[PDB]
Amino acid sequence: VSTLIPPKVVSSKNIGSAPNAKRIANVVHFYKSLPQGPAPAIKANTRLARYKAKYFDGDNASGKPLWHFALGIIAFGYSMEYYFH
Template identity: 55%
Template sequence: MRLPCARNRSSDNPLLPSLSSPLLSSTLLIQQFESSLPKMSYIARRGLSTLIPPKIASPNAIGAAQDAARMERVVNFYARLPRGAAPEVKPTGLIGRYQARYFSGKNASAAPLAHAIGGILIIGYSMEYYFHLRHHKNHPH
């Protein structure tokens, strides 16, 4: 089954200007579609007319860019931005350095678990020793 394809009929109709610009051609197609359906509701016509924003669809916008100075500032801004990957931030503080050493990336290990177990044992032993000494202060064995 062959589907009909659209073709440029500007050469067939002398009233239509040349459709060299895609913005101009789409604007003209929308205008022709709107004029062919006068009984269309206002909401539907408004929806079709706003497919292309008016500033872009205007004939003045098709020529030279009027906001070239603003575009030049944007281009200069992006040209001055640094390229490549951001430099790696060095960790600061005791916890940050500990995390970078044992938790991050290829350095990840189970050492923090061993450190936690050792810390609990040391704190527990010191508490037991202290409270046992308090007991012996007034009660000798």
């Protein structure tokens, strides 16, 4: 018949196709785009990372920290009047 056939030698579609550009981009750019980052500051013993943990975290958005922050100034100016009195 003919055993001469096209698919037995290929050497340009075996490496050929466009998504290679996207590939070489995302192996180099993305491997240090860590899922949770490198564990950021959110709670630690400094006594203000604790403050961040309780009040000013991403989790927080409820009015409880707002209230907590608010109450201080009321006591502050009233006392400071009497510290200046």
